[PDB]
Structure formats: structure tokens, C-alpha cells
Amino acid sequence: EQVVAIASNIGGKQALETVQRLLPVLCQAHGLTPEQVVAIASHDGGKQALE
């Protein structure tokens, strides 16, 4: 279990809840925050019509 999974369990949007949770993490560790690029694209340009 992880915060990125618990929040998404409540919200119902794993790809969206994980990006908001890993946002400060990847922003502090790197800054670029690829999550808003890769994870978002995985849902928008991928798992959209199937979600």
C-alpha cells in the first residue's frame, strides 16, 4: 500500500490522484515532474476511452 494508491482509491482516478501525490515528490527530487507528462499522457492519450 502507498499514499499514491490510497488517495486514488478514494478519488477513483489512479492516474490523476497519483500525479497530484507524486507532484511535490518529483518536483523536489528533480523539479521537472515527469508525472504530469508521462502519467497524464497515459490517461489522456491512452487510458481515456477505457476509463
Side-chain angles (χ1 to χ4, degrees):
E1 296 181 315
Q2 199 175 146
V3 286
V4 298
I6 303 174
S8 38
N9 190 33
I10 304 302
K13 315 169 299 313
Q14 189 175 330
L16 222 145
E17 269 70 277
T18 200
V19 72
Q20 294 290 28
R21 191 72 280 271
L22 287 170
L23 190 82
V25 182
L26 268 300
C27 187
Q28 192 56 89
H30 278 280
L32 175 74
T33 319
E35 308 315 280
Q36 66 126 268
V37 196
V38 57
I40 291 297
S42 306
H43 176 87
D44 183 60
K47 196 106 176 290
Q48 185 84 273
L50 290 320
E51 203 140 83

